[PDB]
Write a protein that binds this DNA or RNA. Structure first.
Ligand SMILES: [Mg+2]
Ligand SMILES: [Mg+2]
Ligand SMILES: [Mg+2]
Ligand SMILES: [Mg+2]
Ligand SMILES: [Mg+2]
Ligand SMILES: [Mg+2]
Ligand SMILES: [Mg+2]
Ligand SMILES: [Mg+2]
Ligand SMILES: [Mg+2]
Ligand SMILES: [Mg+2]
Ligand SMILES: [Mg+2]
Ligand SMILES: [Mg+2]
Ligand SMILES: [Mg+2]
Ligand SMILES: [Mg+2]
Ligand SMILES: [Mg+2]
Ligand SMILES: [Mg+2]
Ligand SMILES: [Mg+2]
Ligand SMILES: [Mg+2]
Ligand SMILES: [Mg+2]
Ligand SMILES: [Mg+2]
Ligand SMILES: [Mg+2]
Ligand SMILES: [Mg+2]
Ligand SMILES: [Mg+2]
Ligand SMILES: [Mg+2]
Ligand SMILES: [Mg+2]
Ligand SMILES: [Mg+2]
Ligand SMILES: [Mg+2]
Ligand SMILES: [Mg+2]
Ligand SMILES: [Mg+2]
Ligand SMILES: [Mg+2]
Ligand SMILES: [Mg+2]
Ligand SMILES: [Mg+2]
Ligand SMILES: [Mg+2]
Ligand SMILES: [Mg+2]
Ligand SMILES: [Mg+2]
Ligand SMILES: [Mg+2]
Ligand SMILES: [Mg+2]
Ligand SMILES: [Mg+2]
Lengths: 155, 125, 260
RNA sequence: UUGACCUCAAAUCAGGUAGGACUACGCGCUGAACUUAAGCAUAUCAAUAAGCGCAGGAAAAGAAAAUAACCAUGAUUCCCUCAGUAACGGCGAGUGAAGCGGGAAAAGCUCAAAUUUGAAAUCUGGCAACAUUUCUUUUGUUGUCCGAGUUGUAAUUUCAAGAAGCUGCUUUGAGUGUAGACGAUCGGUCUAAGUUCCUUGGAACAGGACGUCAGAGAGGGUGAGAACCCCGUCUUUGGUCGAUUGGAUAUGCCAUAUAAAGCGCUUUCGAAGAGUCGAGUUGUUUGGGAAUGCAGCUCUAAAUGGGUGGUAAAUUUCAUCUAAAGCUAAAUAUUGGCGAGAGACCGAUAGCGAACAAGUAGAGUGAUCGAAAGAUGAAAAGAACUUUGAAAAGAGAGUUAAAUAGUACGUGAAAUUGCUGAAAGGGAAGCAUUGGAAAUCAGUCUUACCUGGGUGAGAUCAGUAGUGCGAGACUAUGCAC
RNA sequence: UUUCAAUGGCCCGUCUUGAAACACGGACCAAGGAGUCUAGCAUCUAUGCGAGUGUUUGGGUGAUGAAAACCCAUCCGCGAAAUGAAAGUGAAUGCAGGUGGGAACGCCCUUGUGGCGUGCACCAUCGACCGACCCGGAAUGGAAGGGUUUGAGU
RNA sequence: GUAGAGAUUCUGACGUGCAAAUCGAUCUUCAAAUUUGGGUAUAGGGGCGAAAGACUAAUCGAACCAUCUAGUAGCUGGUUCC
RNA sequence: GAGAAGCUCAGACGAGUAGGCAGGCGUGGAGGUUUGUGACGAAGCCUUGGGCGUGAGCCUGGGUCGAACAGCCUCUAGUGCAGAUCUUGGUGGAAGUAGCAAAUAUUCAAAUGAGAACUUUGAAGACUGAAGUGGGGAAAGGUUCCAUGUGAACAGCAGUU
RNA sequence: CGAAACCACAGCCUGGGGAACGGGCCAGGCAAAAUCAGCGGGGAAAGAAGACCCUGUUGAGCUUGACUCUAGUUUGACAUU
RNA sequence: AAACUUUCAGCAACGGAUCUCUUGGCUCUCGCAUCGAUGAAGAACGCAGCGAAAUGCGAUACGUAAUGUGAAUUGCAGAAUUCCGUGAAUCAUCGAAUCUUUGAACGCACAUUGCGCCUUUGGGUUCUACCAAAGGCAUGCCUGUUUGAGUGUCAUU
């Protein structure tokens, strides 16, 4: 019975908890599996970046609205103002978020600048090799897999 | 040191794979060194033994004896050599088995497949 | 851990009092030796062990990163002390210098013969011979569990770049080779004992300051890391006790032993 | 009377399809009590066990009728955190989520509501021909006819939009074999090195000497601890096969490519799921509190309507979403199955019940229950033959390194027993203290070191000479004889 | 070591006020046989760092050989602020105060258990400051003034 | 009164039995509400009962089997070296 | 110097259940170390020999045996038994004891055989006494049927059956 | 030919004290191998974790106008209509 | 004095501890996705020169075809019509076959090797009986076909 010093005990162990104990002996195995999947994916989509470019958005609530973080995708207005069709955006690694909107010019201008920097660093290969078309590039020889965060970090 | 993920150093597994080996696998397990003259002639270090091969015993109480291999008892990993026997109680002579690793081959029972095995193993005829 | 079902897979029940038998559960039925025998208890043959072992026992132990780095720093400092190498069993009587640092050409060795010849030239090979002579069959049931042979530890070879040095040295008994950027306490203090004999390549030795830093300058390869300070500035306390500044103010020594 | 249509039958009609099993993990239904509350009924155990239905390699969930209340976020899942918190609770015992934030992985879409109406533009089946193949086993194409279908099959659209018109813009999918490589792999091997000498031993794989290889000193085997005897271990290419426009000038060429998308001004527009939402009530459930989800029954909608905004109600604002239809990889799970590598695990009363012909023998009408049991030796060399005995056997012999290894077999404890020896004993025995008796055990002394005595032979010792300046130790050439 | 003599010695374990008990278990021997592991909490100790601390949710050297070692970013937990049911408000009159005892140190005596001056830790104590509460108190705010009080505060 | 079906008394034998219900003698009934094979139905808070809480496979004031379940025990026993 | 964890001098004191703490002894496995032990005999076991410790325990001679094992610093735990009507196995005293006595009953000769109270043949004496100790079936068993052999186990004595 | 129960260790009395009726302790009486058949005084002989009684915040069968429910049944409302 | 009893030791028993071993277990991790009306899982009965349990297999029966290897199997053999070879082997592997009675189990049954029906082809005198062989005959549902039913609704005679 209770007679010692300290907090009154609270332990939630009245169900058959030993039946559902989850151990982590596979933690290094999972880490190796996930790294190998990334390496396998990177070699498959090369020279495309492994990560797609993402917008910068302000987190909600007063606890985090002083910060900046990656969002899901660029708004339709942001893509419009950067001269990118929404159907073309996905074909060149630009995610589209139809749900997010631009309530202020600052959010719009910040992400339009991210797209413009992405497009200026982007090398689009022609659909038919050796027959460059509009919107493509003619110096595809120096194409390599590079990190988007190396070019467009979240500031 | 081994490094392959496909190689097991488990004593339990190695012993199970050795004593449970099938007949054709036990043939490679029962290999003997070639003699010095034969190594140079055929550029081959060792071969699976065969019936009608000529060997000399290199270890044990029968060291220095020579003869044909009369039979390859693979179920026991043993060679039976001609005139290598011991006396039973009743006077009958019982053959004495010798491990293939404990003999050296001095003359090969060469034949079409054996000749093919020498060339495949990188050797010469 | 034992199997969670071990000792549980029976229908046994206590037969209660009045049968002149202990009240432990017993197998029902008939026709077999098992019938009527006691079951389940930690004291019963083919029962369940007391407190069966579980997989969720705590196997791993966390150490604070700074203490781990302290430990490795101490272990590396001990490797610079010839008395500790000798005390830890390393046959270093003939080596020219401690720390022992060899040219970067060793990083490009291709053959075990070259590695062996280098060890003989710097008189480190007697440590390897010690390892070879010490090899034995393990005492006990570990030899049944893939732990057949035991032997002493030889020199630890620490490099900066691997241009073949790892493959040239690895087959030599007792020798371990490690990149300077991943120093391991299990190798630097084997068994928990300080003073591992270490052979550094020039580039590895020249990277130690960037690896560890100093007490006042941050390590380049360990963000915000500084070497620890000691609690005593001069550890030669015998010198301090017998120093002029101390001996000139003490009282008269007094008798070490007195007559009865 | 026939025919059409509708509805409904039958056939061993032509062709298909479902069931049973596996259940570790997955989606549901149904559903306890032991237990805890120091009694006990609500509560808890537990939305658990048992029972029932149904799947896959994962399942389920999923592109907001979602958050929030911010400078806002942005499908789902999982992890960390939120948090043992808000909350629930005979507010007792106990119970207990979510938004943000960080991270793993990321992917988005399909219908129904529209007049193609200058053309059902759609689909199945039969028959025939022509292709195709993991494959004579697979998978289609075209033609034709018949069915389906206007009680609606296609096409543009799915609200993120979009459609119809006004006006201005560029233009793309498939066969052959090279090199670069890549999945099953291989005639699978170029892949290294002692089986020399001595000692012990039945056996060398032991100890010693002398060597060798090492990108190989993992492991196993072999008559005892083998890197070099054997298999392997380590290292590294060349013969195929198939995916082979996946990438390259992917060349060399097929001839796809003539009419479909992108933005661009102006309009008028913009169909959007009903016994459903919602309300009441009853039961259940939840952390969800004047109802969180689910279900029954009653009532039963609307069109800037409707849902949500965690205290019931009426009103007014604001924000946010857009239900009642649908699909979807990954990150997640996995005590089943299959394959593989390990372990500070157990070591034959242990470890699975089962190391062995184990879910076996055996029990029970049945549901079910369910053991015990590993080790001669390197090799059977498993004891010829003689003798005694009806025989089983014994005794000689024999084999073996060993029979103090004889299969009733490694070692071979204790309880318990026989024989031999010793000793003691008047209704227990055992123990303690002290000695007697008998039996039995240890002193190895006076070795070392020092001096004296006897004889003996001998490169002969103290101070010095010389070879780091002053003082001290040492070795070394001679003298000191 | 055995045995004899003399003297002493009840059968152990257990529950119990009390066991040699006519209280219970125990015929014998072998092998097995019972305070563990986990989620917490509390004191004490050790170690690291310290107004901070915590690399193991994750990501990287990584492919070689890698369940280890080693490295690395943003969050987050606990701590750096309390109080109140809450809306809220939120810690220096002063050397971050005074008093008493007091470690250590310094100075004077004159050989005493001394006197004098600073005064760490800790305890007792008088105040000040923050929150709550109770006051008067010159639409909204509660500033100066107070209080026998109150808080797991400064 | 015999076969069959029972089971009163000896409180006989036996009572580590021939036997987890038997043996001897004695006794009850012996042409019907009789005795009985096989087939068939009723199953556990259920059955079945000319009723004894009887019987339901040596089990009955609620069978047997497995599971929940290592159920809980303020109670008894034990709890290993100096 | 005197493992400063050392050395040295002195004084007082000593019951203990339940209980508390400390320092030690012993066991399996892990890291380190010890030119550690070992087929010229490891481990284990026996002992009518020796030594050490207050004790837990430890070392050693002799015997047996045959393949591994130990000391020191650390790590770790399924780590120490006289008891639990404890578990499983083995084995005792009771003991050559209780007993092997229902169902009337056996005897002689021969054969066979190593061996005959129990086999077979002949002879005698008896019993079931047709609601049978006779001759068949149903259920249940499943080869028990028959011949030839055998005689370890079983036939609670025996065995040629 | 060949079990079993039972068994701390055992087994000659009187008195004392004592868990209040001892085989063992204290004081006496005494005391001689190995055994057979019987016997029923003693071993508070064996059996079975007392079935009587009490205690337990332990049950179960049964009862009832106990507490709390419940199949069923009855009456009404609403729907079917 | 023996016998007897008791203790100890040697030796011999009884028993199977101890030690050493271990093709087993347990636990962790990594990888993979594949049952069945084309008859599964499971059950039964059979198959080898001498084979009962296990493995395997199915009247093609410890197997056939095919591919690889290349001389065994082994307890006894037998086979040297083969061993410089399309060839030993309970070898490995595996893309073709065989695959009894059953079982979801499918003509109806089943404590029955019980009782039927259909098609074709054969046998015996038999287009109808009998015998044999081959191939067939369950249920629900779907698309389609054919043949129909209705005082369901119609047009034309
Ligand atoms: Mg067990
Ligand atoms: Mg051992
Ligand atoms: Mg309760
Ligand atoms: Mg209770
Ligand atoms: Mg109760
Ligand atoms: Mg269930
Ligand atoms: Mg499947
Ligand atoms: Mg799905
Ligand atoms: Mg949508
Ligand atoms: Mg709950
Ligand atoms: Mg909708
Ligand atoms: Mg329910
Ligand atoms: Mg021997
Ligand atoms: Mg006395
Ligand atoms: Mg007491
Ligand atoms: Mg007592
Ligand atoms: Mg009592
Ligand atoms: Mg009692
Ligand atoms: Mg007793
Ligand atoms: Mg024990
Ligand atoms: Mg009587
Ligand atoms: Mg328990
Ligand atoms: Mg229980
Ligand atoms: Mg004391
Ligand atoms: Mg253990
Ligand atoms: Mg020995
Ligand atoms: Mg003894
Ligand atoms: Mg002593
Ligand atoms: Mg234990
Ligand atoms: Mg014991
Ligand atoms: Mg005890
Ligand atoms: Mg007992
Ligand atoms: Mg008798
Ligand atoms: Mg008569
Ligand atoms: Mg008569
Ligand atoms: Mg008859
Ligand atoms: Mg008595
Ligand atoms: Mg009682």
């Amino acid at each position: 019975a209770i007679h010692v010093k300290g907090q009154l005990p609270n332990a939630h162990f009245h169900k058959d908890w030993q039946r559902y104990v989850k151990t982590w002996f596979n933690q290094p195995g999972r880490k190796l599996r996930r790294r190998q999947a990334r390496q396998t994916k990177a070699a498959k989509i090369a020279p495309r970046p492994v990560e797609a470019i993402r917008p910068a958005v302000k987190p909600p609530t007063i606890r985090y609205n002083m910060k900046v973080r990656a969002g899901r995708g660029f708004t339709l207005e942001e893509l419009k103002a950067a001269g990118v069709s929404r159907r073309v955006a996905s074909t060149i690694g630009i995610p589209v978020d139809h749900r997010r909107r631009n309530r202020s010019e600052e959010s719009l201008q910040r992400n339009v600048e991210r797209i413009k920097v992405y497009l200026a660093h982007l090398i689009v290969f022609p659909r038919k090799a050796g027959q460059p078309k509009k919107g493509d590039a003619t110096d595809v020889s120096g194409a390599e897999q590079t990190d988007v965060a190396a070019v467009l970090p979240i500031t | 040191m081994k490094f392959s993920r496909d190689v097991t150093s488990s004593r339990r597994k190695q012993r199970k794979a050795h004593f449970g080996a099938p007949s054709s696998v036990r043939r490679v397990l029962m290999s003997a060194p070639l003699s010095k003259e034969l190594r140079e002639q055929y550029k081959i270090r060792s071969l699976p033994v065969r019936r009608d091969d000529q060997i000399t015993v290199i270890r044990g109480s029968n060291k220095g004896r020579e003869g044909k291999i009369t039979s390859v008892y693979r179920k026991k990993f043993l060679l039976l050599i001609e005139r290598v026997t011991r006396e039973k109680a009743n006077g009958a002579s019982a053959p004495v088995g010798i491990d293939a690793s404990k003999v050296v081959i001095t003359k090969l029972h060469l034949d079409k497949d054996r000749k093919d095995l020498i060339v495949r193993k990188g050797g010469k005829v | 851990a034992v199997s969670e079902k071990a000792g549980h897979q029976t229908s046994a029940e206590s037969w209660g009092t009045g049968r002149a038998l202990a009240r432990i559960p017993r197998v029902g039925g008939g026709g077999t030796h098992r019938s009527g025998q006691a079951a389940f208890g930690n004291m019963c043959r083919s029962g369940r062990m007391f407190a069966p072992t579980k997989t969720w026992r705590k196997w791993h132990v966390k150490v604070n990163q700074n203490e781990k780095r302290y430990a490795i720093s101490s272990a590396v400092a001990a490797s610079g002390v010839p008395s500790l190498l000798l005390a830890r069993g390393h046959r270093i009587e003939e080596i020219p210098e401690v720390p022992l640092v060899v040219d970067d050409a060793v990083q490009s060795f291709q053959k075990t013969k070259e590695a062996v010849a280098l060890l003989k030239e710097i008189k480190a090979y007697r440590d390897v011979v010690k390892v070879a002579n010490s090899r034995k069959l393990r005492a006990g049931k570990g030899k049944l569990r893939n732990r057949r042979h035991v032997q002493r530890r030889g020199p630890l070879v620490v490099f900066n770049e691997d241009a073949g040095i790892v493959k040239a040295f690895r087959n030599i008994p007792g020798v371990e080779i490690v990149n300077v950027r991943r120093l391991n306490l299990l190798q630097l203090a084997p068994g928990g004992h300080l003073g591992r004999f270490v052979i550094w390549t020039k580039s590895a030795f020249g990277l130690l300051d960037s690896v560890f830093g100093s007490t006042t300058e941050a390590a380049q390869l360990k963000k915000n890391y500084f070497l620890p300070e000691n609690i005593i500035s001069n550890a030669d306390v015998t010198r301090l006790i017998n120093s002029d500044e101390i001996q000139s103010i003490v009282k008269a020594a007094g008798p070490s032993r007195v007559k009865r």
